[PDB]
Amino acid sequence: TDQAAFDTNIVTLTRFVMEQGRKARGTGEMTQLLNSLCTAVAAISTAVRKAGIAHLYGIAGSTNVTGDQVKKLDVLSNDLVINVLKSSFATCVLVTEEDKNAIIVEPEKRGKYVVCFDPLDGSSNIDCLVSIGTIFGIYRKNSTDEPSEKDALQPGRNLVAAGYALYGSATMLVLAMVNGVNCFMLDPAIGEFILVDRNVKIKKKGSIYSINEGYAKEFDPAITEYIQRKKFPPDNSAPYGARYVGSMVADVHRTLVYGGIFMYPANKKSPKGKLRLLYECNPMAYVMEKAGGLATTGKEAVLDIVPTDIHQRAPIILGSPEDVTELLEIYQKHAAK
């Protein structure tokens, strides 16, 4: 904005979420929900860096603790999130990756908000200590009937706020809402998320493609062509550098920052893709969009899809708009009846 004097400002998530809600002039039911997520993320971060790992390994004498088939990070995560969220008194339906059925919040603690989440993502690949994260999407209950599992089933286009928490070399909470995508970072010493990036928009074109090339054998022709074009470029420019961490949060996030494109196409084994719609694809699609990028299934678009199963998968391609445009055309070229 235009002019003044001395302004040294430190925006903390809680402050932001607070201000933002007041402008919205909303009651604060959400703002509660938003803070409850904030706390889940920080406690999960602590679990993820294996704080207290010493007790499990005999510092306290190896009491009753043992690392193998006992306290797993997933369950704990799902426990926290569901707990910390019900007590927010703002949710009426929790749809989680780890929980088969849609959780319907007991009336005493009901709220007008549906929350779809993946407590710990890439959690398998924690043994290799690779970057995992938490993804979430929030919808507002637009029904009138008792909060049925159905209330989750809404196009991503209906999201009221979405985002993910990356537990990489440092912990980042990316939040996206109507007006923008903002990245807040955790300062562990004081347990606070500081706005380190405001109104994040993604590069028009990038120089990285992210895909598990090992499925080459089963990739569709349109994809095969796109990739070859990145490796061996026609006009003889620089080829695209490749990346594949193997963790959705890590790839989407790097795509959001350096640009480039991510893809997890349909292949026979998962002809509907591996990634889920409600709590993986959608929240990420939503962020890409608010950032100025594109999330497409290759033929249609992620957010316009209308779910029929809370656990339904979907292909997903998202990244810089210009790259994703390039791949969408190649799909057109090959598209037929």
Place this chain on the structure above:
Amino acid sequence: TDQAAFDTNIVTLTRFVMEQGRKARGTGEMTQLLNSLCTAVAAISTAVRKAGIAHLYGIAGSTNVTGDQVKKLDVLSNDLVINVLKSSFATCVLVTEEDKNAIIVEPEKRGKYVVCFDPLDGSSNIDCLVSIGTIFGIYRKNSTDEPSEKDALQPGRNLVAAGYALYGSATMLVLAMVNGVNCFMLDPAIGEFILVDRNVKIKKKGSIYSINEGYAKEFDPAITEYIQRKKFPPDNSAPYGARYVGSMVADVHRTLVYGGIFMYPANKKSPKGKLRLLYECNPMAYVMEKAGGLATTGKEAVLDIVPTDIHQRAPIILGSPEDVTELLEIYQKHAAK
């Protein structure tokens, strides 16, 4: 062994290292080195976790800017290492990537070990919260003359200890020395590395190849032919998964743990590979060979190469043994003249 069922107790790094040096009646000058290097790691992890960022963003009101010097991470890291090193009174020649020349420790702090390190690998891939690390290789001075750069130029086969710390969703330290490879997890809550994996041995055969396929264009046939046999197996068996975090510590680490192979061979833009020998190549190689795998370059083994220059580069291929011998064969099948 006499009587001890399924047992296991707390074992810190410090204690671990300590008894190891007792076992082989060392003067205790090296213990002081592993001791020091470790303190360095522990602290760097913390700088890497952007812990304390709050103050840096005005929460403390950057008066006229503040801090006890916390700038470019790789620069402060570089400092921190060289610092707790000289003060170990166990080093004579320190070689850093971030340093054009070799460092020759003044006579006061002058020890006897030559130490090579890459203070922060992935230093640029940092903005993405994508795992970074620290690599160090230790050499025993072998000469009579004044320590200098030449004392650093010894083939990897002459290493005495070698490891790397990986800053990811957890901070892990891997330490290999004559007996084997031992992984210590940093329990941040109490600031101590705990022994979680002792005597690590690698998978004879994994299901993952790792490489920047962005360079497929500049790939020598053997490589190019190998990648193919993984994507589309000749014997119509399940194809290899692919994973490229784009950070050596993370990929070398994933390959150590989960099995598989890692490739960073020569190309049109880098005839001798991109990876530096003394501080990236030999350490990973040493760990690898001590873990049970191989570390070839295509035709010769990493550890035998005799260094003509401290900042020398080299192509590298390391991983499971059955896997690295397959690519070697392919490399033999395509004999060069």
Place this chain on the structure above:
Amino acid sequence: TDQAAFDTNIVTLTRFVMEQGRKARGTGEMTQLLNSLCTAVAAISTAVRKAGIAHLYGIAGSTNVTGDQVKKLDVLSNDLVINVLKSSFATCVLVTEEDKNAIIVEPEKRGKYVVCFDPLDGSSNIDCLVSIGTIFGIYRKNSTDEPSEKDALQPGRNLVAAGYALYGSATMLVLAMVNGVNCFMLDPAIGEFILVDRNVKIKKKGSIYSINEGYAKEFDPAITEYIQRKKFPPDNSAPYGARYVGSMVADVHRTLVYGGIFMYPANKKSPKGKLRLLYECNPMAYVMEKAGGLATTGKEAVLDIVPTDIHQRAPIILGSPEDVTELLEIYQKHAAK
């Protein structure tokens, strides 16, 4: 309250402050202020445990850091609080122990709240590592004229919320408002204050008197008598155990928990007492009251005093109601013209 089923609840300060404000049906200007204090307390706690002390002492090479006459805990504290508070956009006047004049917040950031505070209390006695704390009192600007220093000058009875943060063996934030006194405790691992005590009320009678007996020579007769009665009890019961930490927050807090009584009478040197009215006595008096205890100057009562100097001192006696009643009578007995 009466009946239900399964209720496992974790109340975090932020949540509490949030809920409480909604019931109040207030806009949220305060709630902002309340959270801004919450963050100051946590950052100061970090400074108090000397986190990063290593950098000042050469880990980073003793860069430009030196411990003596450089970065002091007081100033830093006062810097944070004033900073973090102005940016709350909820304060128009800050009266601090460490700042001679009443700070008048620049219009861009003005709010309808006056905040009186002692950034670091007992800060002198930190060398002996003894318990220090932060005290604060909040008044609502009841004037109409430009926020003049005068706006601070209001009887403690006019406080809208008050409390203190103890940085003892563990960090506690005690908050008091119209409806009650609640103690929240910091879990450093996740940077969150959990309600560990709800609606704290103090014991009618105690068994500890807290006073610097070294001033015996100059104590008034009424005090001299009270003390002798604790030491040598008339009715031959158990004498009172004595305590004197030398830090107001530590004594007031232990008085609030185990009961007993605190005193810091007038003596010739400080015939008006040592403790200040606006940001030491008043906030503590206010807490004692809401807890069911009493804060008296010996003749009148702390909260009814009407200030004329923002830095004016005042005697103060506070603790269990029955003990403080006992001492008030003894003052009556001796009181005259």
Place this chain on the structure above:
Amino acid sequence: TDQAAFDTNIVTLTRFVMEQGRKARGTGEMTQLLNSLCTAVAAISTAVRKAGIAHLYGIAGSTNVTGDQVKKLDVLSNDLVINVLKSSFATCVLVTEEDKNAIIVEPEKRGKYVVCFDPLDGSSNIDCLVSIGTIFGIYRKNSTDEPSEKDALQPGRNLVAAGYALYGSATMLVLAMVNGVNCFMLDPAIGEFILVDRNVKIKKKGSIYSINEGYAKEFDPAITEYIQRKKFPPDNSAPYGARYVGSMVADVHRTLVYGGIFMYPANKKSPKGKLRLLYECNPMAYVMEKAGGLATTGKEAVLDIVPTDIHQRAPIILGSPEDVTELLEIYQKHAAK
């Protein structure tokens, strides 16, 4: 000394201890002991900071209650110490306050040093966030027979190392051994004790007496007469300040640093003082004498007392030297028959 202006660099405990043992060619069995004991402290500090309380209050949803065993602090502490101790392979007889008998380390872990500790002094004064601590005194086994309780019964004069860790607004470790007393500050951020005060020597004469005047009734004349000379000095000089935190580590610590004296003499309810000799009295005494002060009991010196029982008690008077010799005189002036 040769050339070094006003200089100072980072010095960790570990490094410090390490070189100390090198200097006096120890087998390194004791280094392993100071090493171990320290890890214990570091961890206890953390349990004492109630860090992790969140989960304990349902944030993680105490499923059917959880934890890696974190109960009564003094009980877990007691455990932790005895644990990292046996596993040091440096202890034969461990004596704990919380333990009715002496612990005799099994032959496998059986070392040679006898270790006496009070795992958590102030354990009850904890609810008030009032500083607590840990005290330990080390004895070298002197016998040929089977280690047992008698090996613990040696006068304080035969101690080899002694110290205490104080958990207050900071975690400090004080270590005294033949050469002197050295204070190490715990920098929690990186989990390492840093040398802040080397070779501490106490004030010949302080301005603070310390004692539970609640017991004035049961005070022996010399004491009673001494307290008077401080409150109302005969030579009409400034009176002594008084401070009684009601926790030995905090008061012994304040007295070490700021000067002054500390008294816990006999009385009607405790003819032999309340403080236990082996784990509270001798350590503080040793530190005191090594700091430059005295530690008398009234007529004989603490360190010479020969223990008839491990849980023996003793009155104690320690502090500045000129101060402790004044009370002694007074104690001589009131000769007992």
